[PDB]
Design a protein around this ligand. Structure first.
Ligand SMILES: *[C@@H]1O[C@H](CO)[C@@H](O[C@@H]2O[C@H](CO)[C@@H](O)[C@H](O)[C@H]2NC(C)=O)[C@H](O)[C@H]1NC(C)=O
Ligand SMILES: *[C@@H]1O[C@H](CO)[C@@H](O[C@@H]2O[C@H](CO)[C@@H](O)[C@H](O)[C@H]2NC(C)=O)[C@H](O)[C@H]1NC(C)=O
Ligand SMILES: Cc1ccc(Nc2c(F)cccc2Cl)c(CC(=O)O)c1
Ligand SMILES: Cc1ccc(Nc2c(F)cccc2Cl)c(CC(=O)O)c1
Ligand SMILES: *[C@@H]1O[C@H](CO)[C@@H](O)[C@H](O)[C@H]1NC(C)=O
Ligand SMILES: *[C@@H]1O[C@H](CO)[C@@H](O)[C@H](O)[C@H]1NC(C)=O
Ligand SMILES: *[C@@H]1O[C@H](CO)[C@@H](O)[C@H](O)[C@H]1NC(C)=O
Ligand SMILES: *[C@@H]1O[C@H](CO)[C@@H](O)[C@H](O)[C@H]1NC(C)=O
Lengths: 552, 552
């Protein structure tokens, strides 16, 4: 019924109904005009020829390594390029946010209600004839069939980029502070009202939860010592609610910021490391400020660990998966002379892109042991058995699975991979090509172009019939990977804008926050600016084991 | 004890303790250096000579009326000047926000907790020897003595700018959507979690309250017809909670967005006007969009009334009290090529500046009646008796009191004016001169310089002894007024940055929102851009009575 169901407006134009069977496109500041905003203005036509393809920019950044060696050592030039990286990506994000799962039009409810994930593209109207709008059949192909044919893992396909389990669990740990779906309300809702990197997975979402976790001495968080090693406190000691099976002994019920981090020892490993990092920073700040109280020591340490997290994510984590030879740089000053909104709203699609199920291995290999999913889940006894040192060394060695390329989703999490499909449909997501156009990508003309091969493409064509009906999430996992890369084009070109906007949109990156006094002086400021995944492990894990996000 | 108690850092430098009796100033991006950030850099020294005094800029804007007549009709030039107005003011505001009543240092608690008013200046630390830091005596002068000597009204002093009661009640009505002190928590807390112009005083703060107020037909709000006139619904009919004395008849207990607007008929008058405006806009939008449902009609009308509100505040309301001959302009496009944060956090100080107690008259003169405070309070029967038309005509005629100049606080509200003083001390406000310096003003060197006279100045000197101890709030009401103006310099130079930042910081002023489709097309967009305090009254009040923010 809705005349906008066909998504007629192009180039980020906005569609509005002007009757029961008529519409109008708002071409304001899109650079285009005409009925569907497809006729480019003069300046627009120029940029279309100048601006390079994303597979060209990716090529430049991931090749000419000898040239980048020169550029990386020229601070002026390095800053110039990183500046362009930050600005060009964040331009794709609406800020302040617009739509959510319940509003395909702008409204104060959509803006003000922080319980929603926001949406980069509006939901398909409920009164639309087809799930994608007007194209396709009355119902999308069976999600179980999509899963089994092109998603489920036959043989384990390792990541050619060499991403290890330190990378895998970091991603899971890091993103679970702003991906906290409120399953009581629905998949389009979140419990992470900070909508960013606030480290609530360490300190707790609520003030009540934070105080139960705090020692209230020297700004530190509560902890316990087991075998001479520092571990998180227990549920019994702090009364913070955690998610554990009833058969789990209460001395193994560790209490941390995020309630689900008891799920896997890999998450509990990072929770422990970050816990130690907080208290380490407390000691350092106390050395500098003996006149400071517990409260200021805590708050300043939290701001410092936020800085470290963003530092590490940009210069280690993102640096790895991007495959760039350009040396990425966390420098908030790069945006001080730029137009930039220091705010963020977590997008539903960003959460969907981050469903990296194929990343998981078939077994979790710690030391000489090889644990199954059943043995690994909710089993912190494994962590106490081997220790953090053995955990880091083992996870540094074990490679992770390739995400793009198809058929690499471990069958142990098939219900989870199917939920992504189902829930994406439940949230009325628009098609793959709609999202590609939204982020300046050309639509795929065939399933073969999408997969880069023949077999899976044929399988998908039997299911979806039309390429313009192809869903976003399963397309990410079967997409033709970039040359020896872990991802396809869609994953990176869509995800980077959400990521960098979330990282740089943090208030500590703003000019009034980004100064030594915010972090207790130059000493605390230096902790942020010299942070790395290696130094994080070195300072907090016994023996200072070598670590990295790739296998050696 | 705290080495920062003397507020040693100048030019918005930040003070940090480096020991029990030592400090360090963070001079980052202040334009100054040295121990106290008092030594100007070269570029800074230039601007100091170039940049004009606020009492000179005010002079230019409020004089040379013949010249402004030419400028106002040159769209390029008018836009250029309004641009500078918006940018130069908003630069004084920290955005994202920093301090609150409980944090004199930056912290994630201070940033993330929206229940706090933010603070333009940090509170004086609790372990400071004197209430202002180090200067003055152990305790500030008795607030009752300050009140009775230089604040309380002897003879009614009318506003020379001709501000009427339409202005007074507009101010009270308008500001009570973001000044909603949570008295359960303390004076530094707020219930207005939107921290801006969201019109929650019309639509309710919570979703539960909004749905009780809505008709769920044609996007409209519930209403009742009394004597052929449209008035708000009752508490009994809608079950929304309002604040009323137990003796108030339930047919007179009107239910509106703000729970306190039953307090005075002046507020209920505006609540009724805006209620009618929402339903009027619903009719217009329904005419254009018969295919729209109740929800979209409601949401779009709300965004439109938000636009009208900002439009009226800038071009009628602010236009009046500013005294400018320059024609102010609400144009979000003026900031599209500028650096600006589309966000806002309501400052405690802005609330304190807005305690315009001297504005109130001695009686509320409606038609041929003259009501006392006792008769006027909680008496909506007055509103039904005379009607909206008579209210508008009467309030347009009745002049309001001068705010600056001293001794004009009506004794009927002395308990409220005393509370303003006491709560300011409770929230540990810094001195008047500290806040003047914060907003680029020179400190007052004497009480005579502050008041511009002799008698009140002597009174204050006996109470405060030192000018550097003089409090902010009572200083506003006794300050030497600008020539034939309602305010002194401090009130305007401090308030204008808070005001304009809140208005333009609204998400509908952002480039992604500021387009016709957001407001249902050009017809709705036109409503915002042609809104005025007169058109608001003309469209919604029978007879289209003349109205204005000044007496005729
Ligand atoms: C914002 O800060 C206020 C003040 O600290 C918090 O209110 C306190 O909440 C605790 C519960 O954890 C109560 O025991 C205190 O009595 C409250 N104090 C006051 C003054 O009300 C509030 O919880 C914080 N809000 C958020 C969202 O964290
Ligand atoms: C944000 O939106 C959600 C969804 O509309 C609101 O949750 C609803 O709240 C009402 C109460 O007013 C309940 O009757 C519904 O069952 C809730 N729905 C869901 C899906 O949870 C929520 O209240 C909104 N948040 C705010 C702060 O207004
Ligand atoms: C779904 C997704 C997409 C891209 C990235 N990172 C990334 C990338 F893979 C290439 C260039 C820049 C960035 Cl920020 C990430 C990881 C991250 O930035 O948090 C996730
Ligand atoms: C305490 C206070 C100070 C200044 C103003 N308005 C105002 C003014 F009085 C002069 C110049 C610009 C502006 Cl925005 C106002 C009114 C307002 O904008 O809400 C209140
Ligand atoms: C705009 O799009 C509609 C539907 O997508 C199409 O039928 C029409 O031809 C288009 N108009 C143009 C391209 O001018
Ligand atoms: C948990 O891990 C330990 C190894 O430390 C193993 O012995 C035990 O069987 C595991 N528990 C389950 C339920 O698999
Ligand atoms: C800085 O301020 C302190 C206290 O206000 C003062 O004692 C000191 O002399 C100042 N230092 C300067 C102005 O260099
Ligand atoms: C309320 O106003 C009416 C006039 O409409 C007046 O007669 C009455 O006395 C007032 N009520 C009180 C309690 O003063």
């Amino acid at each position: 019924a809705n005349p906008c169901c066909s998504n007629p407006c192009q180039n980020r134009g906005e569609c509005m109904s002007t009757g029961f069977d008529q519409y109008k496109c708002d071409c304001t500041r899109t650079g285009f005009y005409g009925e569907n905003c497809t006729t480019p203005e003069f300046l627009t036509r120029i940029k279309l020829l100048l601006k390079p393809t994303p597979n060209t920019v990716w090529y430049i950044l991931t090749h000419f390594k000898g040239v980048w060696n020169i550029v990386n050592n020229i601070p002026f030039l390095r800053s110039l390029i990183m500046k362009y990286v930050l600005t060009s990506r964040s331009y794709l994000i609406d800020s302040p946010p617009t739509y959510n799962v319940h509003y395909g039009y702008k409204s104060w409810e959509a803006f003000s209600n922080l319980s929603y994930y926001t949406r980069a593209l509006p939901p398909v109207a409920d009164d639309c004839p087809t799930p994608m709008g007007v194209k396709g059949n009355k119902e999308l192909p069976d999600s179980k069939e999509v899963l089994e044919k092109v998603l489920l893992r036959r043989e384990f396909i390792p990541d050619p980029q060499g991403s290890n389990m330190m990378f895998a669990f970091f991603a899971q740990h890091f993103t679970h502070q702003f991906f906290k779906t409120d399953h009581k309300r629905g998949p389009g809702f979140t419990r992470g009202l900070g909508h960013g990197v606030d480290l609530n997975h360490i300190y707790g979402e609520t003030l009540d939860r934070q105080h139960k976790l705090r020692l209230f001495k020297d700004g530190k968080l509560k902890y316990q010592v087991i075998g001479g090693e520092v571990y998180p406190p227990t549920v019994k000691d702090t009364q913070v609610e955690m998610i554990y099976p009833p058969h789990i002994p209460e001395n193994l019920q560790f209490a941390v910021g995020q309630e689900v981090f008891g799920l896997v020892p890999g998450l509990m490993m990072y929770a422990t490391i970050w816990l130690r990092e907080h208290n380490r920073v407390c000691d350092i700040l106390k050395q500098e400020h003996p006149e400071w109280g517990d409260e200021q020591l805590f708050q300043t340490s939290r701001l410092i660990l936020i800085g470290e997290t963003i530092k590490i994510v940009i210069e280690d984590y993102v640096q790895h998966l991007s495959g760039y030879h350009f040396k990425l740089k966390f420098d908030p000053e790069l945006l001080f002379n730029q137009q930039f909104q220091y705010q963020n709203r977590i997008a539903s699609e960003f959460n969907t892109l981050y469903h990296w199920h194929p990343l998981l291995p078939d077994t979790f290999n710690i030391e000489d042991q090889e644990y199954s999913f059943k043995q690994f889940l909710y089993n912190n006894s494994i962590l106490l058995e081997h220790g953090l040192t053995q955990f880091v060394e083992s996870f540094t060695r074990q490679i992770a699975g390739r995400v793009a390329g198809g058929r690499n989703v471990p069958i142990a999490v098939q219900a989870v991979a199917k939920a992504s499909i189902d829930q994406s449909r439940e949230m009325k997501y628009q098609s793959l090509n709609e999202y590609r156009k939204r982020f300046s990508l050309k639509p795929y003309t065939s399933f073969e172009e999408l997969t880069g091969e023949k077999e899976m493409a044929a399988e998908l064509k039997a299911l979806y019939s039309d390429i313009d009906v192809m869903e976003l999430y399963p397309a990410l996992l079967v997409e033709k990977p970039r040359p020896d890369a872990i991802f396809g084009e869609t994953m990176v070109e869509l995800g980077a804008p959400f990521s960098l906007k979330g990282l740089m949109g943090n208030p500590i990156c703003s000019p009034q926050y980004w100064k030594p006094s915010t972090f207790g002086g130059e000493v605390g400021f230096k902790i942020i600016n010299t942070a790395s995944i290696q130094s994080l492990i070195c300072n907090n894990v016994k023996g200072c084991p070598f670590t990295s996000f790739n296998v050696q």
